[PDB]
């Protein structure tokens, strides 16, 4: 079919599974926050939580599906027909290593609901506790064991794909372990081999020669606010992308529809960027397609606390907040003006 509707795989979007429900998780988790205290505050402060009440949840803005738990079978089902308007193929499952069952029967429901609708999975691997190169290769093999041959899995030209967020916490020479060819504990030329992508942030005179030196595959940017990094200044793409096409690197650039996290960082007024009915999101959009890139990362599907999500919010005030909402549009907006750059992005590779 020649319809402009089919799913992009190329194109990543960057799920949470991190909310609960007391029906099914025991506890409204993640709706439910801890309030962070300011870097820059001083001693002595009890910023306190926010409760994950109805009236009172950890995001500037509200979900249309309510407070789901993310172990919901009925929720996925209705996330995956979001990612089908959307035409978003892969979904990038945060991934936390929790260890617990509850973390294993999610992520089998997550693979099954996805493959219903085509949609492919892959792991964005966040820095859990003790997190090295060793235990990210024992890791990395546990999730190509369990989930490689799930229809859903997601693969690039034979290989599995993950992002590495804060990939700057590990040093270049533990990388190359892991990423030469001839690294002591390499995936290279292994069942394991694997697209691995980490997180370009600061300056190129950093960043080039650690991406170099680390053997990774790609880098992303991950940031939904334009200007905080380096990185997620979407100006420098061009360059970026003509660094990574000269040293035969993937970059994967995060665009966002906007952010604003004052709920759970009140202190941190100054990273926000107002959505302007999508002006800001068309913006940034623009520019990933405009550098040239042969994929797209999407900041995000449902990060609800960082104000990023494109997942759809309802007008909402209650007794104790006054949520934002997707004014003068429609509660999908984001999900069919994710479709359009889709499109653009298709018709530019
Ligand atoms: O997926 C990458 C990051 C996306 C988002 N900034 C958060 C990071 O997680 C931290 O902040 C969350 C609240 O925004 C908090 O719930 C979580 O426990 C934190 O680790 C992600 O790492």
Redesign the pocket.
């Known amino acids: 079919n020649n319809l402009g509707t089919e799913l992009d795989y190329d194109t990543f979007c960057?799920y949470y599974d991190?909310y609960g429900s007391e029906a099914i998780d025991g506890q409204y988790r993640?709706w439910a926050?801890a309030i962070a205290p300011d870097p820059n505050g001083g001693s002595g402060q009890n910023p306190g939580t926010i409760p994950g009440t109805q009236e009172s949840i950890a995001s500037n803005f509200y979900p249309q599906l309510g407070r789901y738990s993310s172990s919901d079978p009925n929720i996925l089902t209705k996330h995956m027909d979001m990612f089908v308007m959307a035409r978003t193929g892969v979904l990038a499952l945060?991934w936390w290593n929790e260890q617990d069952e509850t973390e294993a029967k999610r992520i089998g429901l997550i693979l099954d609901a996805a493959d219903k609708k085509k949609i492919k999975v892959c792991f964005?691997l966040?820095?859990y506790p003790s997190r090295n190169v060793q235990n990210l290769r024992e890791n990395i093999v546990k999730l190509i064991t369990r989930y490689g041959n799930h229809p859903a899995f997601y693969r690039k030209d034979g290989k599995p794909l993950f992002f590495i967020?804060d990939s700057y916490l590990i040093e270049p020479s533990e990388w190359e372990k892991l990423l030469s060819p001839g690294g002591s504990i390499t995936i290279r030329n292994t069942a394991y081999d694997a697209l691995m992508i980490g997180l370009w942030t600061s300056s190129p005179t950093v960043q080039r020669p650690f991406i170099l030196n680390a053997h990774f595959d790609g880098f992303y940017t991950?940031f939904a606010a334009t200007g905080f990094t380096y990185g997620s200044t979407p100006t420098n793409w061009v360059s970026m992308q003509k660094w990574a096409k000269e040293n035969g690197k993937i970059f994967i650039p995060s665009v966002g529809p906007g952010y604003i996290?004052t709920r759970?960082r009140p202190w941190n007024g100054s990273v926000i960027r107002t959505r302007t009915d999508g002006q800001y999101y068309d913006a940034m959009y623009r520019k990933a397609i405009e550098a040239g890139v042969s994929a797209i990362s999407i900041t995000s599907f449902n990060?609800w606390?960082?104000g990023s999500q494109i997942e759809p919010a309802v007008p909402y005030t209650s007794s104790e907040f006054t949520y934002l909402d997707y004014e003068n549009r429609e509660p999908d907006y984001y999900l069919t003006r994710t479709a359009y750059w889709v499109g653009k992005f298709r018709e530019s590779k």
Request: hydrophobic share 20%; net charge negative; glycine share 0%.
């Open positions: 960057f991190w993640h926050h945060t964005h966040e820095p967020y991950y996290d759970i990060e606390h960082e």
